[PDB]
Design a protein around this nucleic acid. Structure first.
Lengths: 204, 102, 203, 99
RNA sequence: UUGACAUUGUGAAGAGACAUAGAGGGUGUAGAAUAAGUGGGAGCUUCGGCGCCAGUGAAAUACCACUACCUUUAUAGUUUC
RNA sequence: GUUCUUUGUAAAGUGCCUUCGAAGAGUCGAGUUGUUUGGGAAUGCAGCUCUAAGUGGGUGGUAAAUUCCAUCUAAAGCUAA
RNA sequence: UUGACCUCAAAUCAGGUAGGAGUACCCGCUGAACUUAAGCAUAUCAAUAAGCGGAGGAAAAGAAACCAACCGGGAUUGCCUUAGUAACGGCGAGUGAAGCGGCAAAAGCUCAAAUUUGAAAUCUGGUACCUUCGGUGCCCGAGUUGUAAUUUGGAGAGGG
């Protein structure tokens, strides 16, 4: 059972020597090969926030640019379409809408190679705003596979309670055993080590 | 270390290193039988003891396990046998003798 | 409870220690008589569980037997029948090697009432077994409310008939819808349904 | 068992009064027991592994279990045996090699 | 008569996978500069070395976990010829 | 029917609480060879190699994989009419 | 060097037990031919005669790793039925069950697997005496690589 060691409990809230917030990363080991069809490319919805300083550039209009400045990082418009087309890019991802289909051609020339644009297979265009801002500042994080049998990403912070982290890795461990094919090998849940940035890594 | 059926004795030393009691292999199952008014026994247990020899008993326990209990996990990766006879020792060792250091 | 350890021990035959002793024993018997009695069972576990009490009236007999098949006794492969019934090599037998060794020890030990044996050795040209017979004339056993049936004339040559477990396995007198091939006497059940039973009153 | 009271059905039969007596041991002839537990583990450590048992863990760790159940059905008989048999294999793979 | 498997074992060497801890290396033009390479990152840190916001490029560096390919680079154990 | 000796600090069984309850392996089963059979992807039997397990296991008459239900107690012997 | 152990012998030592017959009938292994197919090779006759091994008064078989799929029954034999049917088969000539049901018949159990362990209490034989299908005292040996008692799953044992 998960509640003795850390993983997302307590333990590593004293082994730290850093004063600034450190984002932990969950390291897995799911037995898979060079195939594409057999694997997970899904995203586990985390209920609690990661408090990540990953600024955004979401350009909206009408009843979509009101609940913008309350849960995220920055507030844009359809005219502020001549700010991120020049010499400044620090953002990690963007977000548009349906009313923003006409004004979606002046933002694709700077986001193709890196991929921070609004697409057909990329989470960005949605009409009802106030709902997806609890999944952007909370960091939903995407899961992908390079070529073999392992997976790493970003979970939460090491300064939150023991029960504010146990409900975040409950539906993140369930997505790494459900979306993953049985077209795999022995146990999809084996080694399970976890480190932040410097400290140690505990397994269960 | 006798008994034709050696399979009747190869499980005793393992059950001993699992409980924590002293064991000692003697070289005579026929002798283990005459001190018990029999022919052969091979098996000799010591359960109830008197307040006479209890002292000379803990000293012996130490010498015994000193040789068997501890080197148990040791010779568990060591193979016995493979000793050649006179004809094969000399001819074959005087072969690896006069091909290197002659 | 040494018997429990010895029993799961005789099931780890694919281990390094078991391959050792069955390779040591098998050979020493190959330099002895083919038909040579044994003063002590090499398997206390198997011996006793079948039926073995240490005393004057229980003899063990070490038996080394050959294998292969049974070539028909025809001069140069010369048969004189129909193509179907005209082979010599894929010629088996209707009895097991266990039952065969008993037949030969009952001819040497004609005075003992054979009981049951077991599997011990086997390499390539020879298979090994060791059977146990009883004393139908010894006083200590002639009595005893366990073996008073040994002195009854109805057991003389149990292997020539098949009153043994290996004989009742090779015969097939067990319970089953598949065992209804000869559930009750080979040619007995045969002659039975293959006979015309008519009464004074034909209905 | 509570049927349907008619000819056929998902419970094809009559609804008569139930009785149910005491339990039987003619159902536990293959039980756990503290006696057989002690005995069977003790002998697995004394003899070691067989030739294919070495190459069994080697074809799991290195390749797969779809591969172990594939060659275990060739070494034995059933897929049902491969189930509990190859299941028991990884019981020692984990509870020993790492933990 | 010929192939295979059992019988049928206990070693050395030459290629030979692989547990496991370290060490290690690869795009041209260019940006001081070693690029298939993602994110955490304004600090790990008395030293201040890199920073960094900046910036040239297709990809931006330490606290570096490692999604890591890969090293016939070697070790501590099993392998087919 | 009569009649000798009390067999005895002799054993078995009934009601209640708790812990246990050990039960047969080169056997089972598989591929295959032949042969038998009402038996039909295989009824049995012997041979060959392989080679089990314990909330197990055999059987449920179309194999097979998948999730269940049922039903017995093998690989020990004896017993009249 | 004396004394045990295991193992293999020895005799006109002591005590025993095996053989062939008979073979109507029952248990096995091996095993045909004719015959049919209007021919004839798988098929059939036949899972037959002979042949060789083996006992009894009967024997063999037997208390399920049984049959079912029932409102489940419940060892073994046997007659009636199933039926000339399910089935098999150059789907040819042909061959070929079983469950259930009725009834005569009707007996149940015991060994290993448990620490008798505050006691190998058990058994062979020699000998003495006797009430002799045998008993009791002694002297040896088997046997601890395990003889009495408890217990066989339907239970059951230890503690109380």
């Amino acid at each position: 059972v998960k509640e003795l060691l850390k993983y997302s409990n307590e333990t590593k809230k004293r082994n730290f020597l850093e004063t600034v917030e450190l984002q932990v990363g969950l390291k897995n080991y799911d037995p898979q090969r060079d195939k594409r069809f057999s694997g997970s490319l899904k995203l586990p919805n985390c209920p609690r926030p990661n408090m990540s300083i990953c600024i955004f550039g979401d350009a909206f209009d009408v009843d979509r640019a009101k609940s913008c400045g309350v849960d995220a990082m920055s507030v844009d418009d359809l005219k502020k379409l001549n700010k991120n087309k020049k010499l400044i890019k620090k953002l990690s991802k963007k977000y548009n809408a349906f009313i923003a289909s006409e004004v979606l051609i002046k933002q694709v020339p700077r986001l193709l190679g890196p991929q921070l644009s609004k697409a057909g297979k990329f989470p960005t265009p949605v009409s009802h705003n106030d709902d997806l801002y609890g999944k952007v500042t909370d960091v939903r994080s995407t899961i992908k596979f390079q070529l073999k049998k392992v997976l790493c990403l970003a979970v939460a912070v090491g300064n939150v309670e023991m029960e504010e982290d146990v409900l975040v890795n409950q539906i993140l461990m369930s997505v790494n055993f459900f979306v993953s094919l049985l077209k795999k090998n022995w146990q999809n849940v084996g080694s399970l080590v976890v480190k932040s940035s410097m400290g140690p890594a505990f397994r269960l | 270390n006798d008994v034709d059926p050696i399979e009747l004795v190869v499980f005793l030393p393992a059950l001993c290193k699992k409980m924590g009691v002293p064991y000692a292999i003697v070289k005579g199952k026929a002798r283990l039988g005459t001190l018990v008014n029999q022919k052969t026994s091979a098996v000799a247990a010591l359960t109830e003891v008197r307040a006479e020899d209890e002292a000379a008993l803990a000293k012996l326990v130490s010498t015994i396990d000193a040789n068997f209990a501890d080197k148990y996990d040791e010779v568990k990766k060591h193979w016995g046998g493979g000793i050649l006879g006179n004809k094969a020792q000399a001819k074959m060792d005087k072969r690896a003798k006069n091909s290197d250091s002659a | 409870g040494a018997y429990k350890y010895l029993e799961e021990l005789q099931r780890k035959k694919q281990s390094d220690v078991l391959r050792f002793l069955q390779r040591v024993r098998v050979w020493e018997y190959r330099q002895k008589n083919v038909i040579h009695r044994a003063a002590r069972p090499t398997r206390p576990d198997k011996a006793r569980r079948l039926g073995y009490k240490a005393k004057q009236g229980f003899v063990i007999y070490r038996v080394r037997v050959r294998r292969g098949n049974r070539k028909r006794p025809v001069p140069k492969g010369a048969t004189y029948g129909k193509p179907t019934n005209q082979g010599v090599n894929e010629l088996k037998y209707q009895r097991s090697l266990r039952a065969t060794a008993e037949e030969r020890v009952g001819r040497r030990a004609a005075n003992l009432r054979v009981l049951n044996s077991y599997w011990v050795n086997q390499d390539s040209t020879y298979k090994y077994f060791e059977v146990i017979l009883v004393d139908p004339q010894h006083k200590a056993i002639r009595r005893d409310a366990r073996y008073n049936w040994i002195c009854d004339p109805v057991h003389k040559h149990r292997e020539a008939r098949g009153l043994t477990a290996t004989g009742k396995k090779s015969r097939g007198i067990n319970k089953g819808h598949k065992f209804n091939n000869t559930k009750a006497g080979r040619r007995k059940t045969w002659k039975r349904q293959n006979t015309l039973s008519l009464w004074r009153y034909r209905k | 068992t509570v049927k349907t009271g008619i000819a056929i059905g998902l419970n094809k039969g009559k609804k008569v009064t139930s009785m149910t007596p005491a339990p039987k041991i003619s159902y536990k002839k293959g039980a756990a027991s503290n006696r057989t537990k002690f005995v069977r583990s003790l002998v697995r450590e004394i003899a070691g592994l067989s030739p294919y048992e070495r190459r069994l863990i080697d074809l799991i760790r290195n390749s797969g279990e779809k591969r172990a159940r594939k060659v275990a059905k060739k070494r034995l008989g059933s897929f049902t045996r491969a189930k509990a048999k190859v299941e028991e294999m990884n019981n020692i793979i984990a509870a020993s090699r790492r933990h």
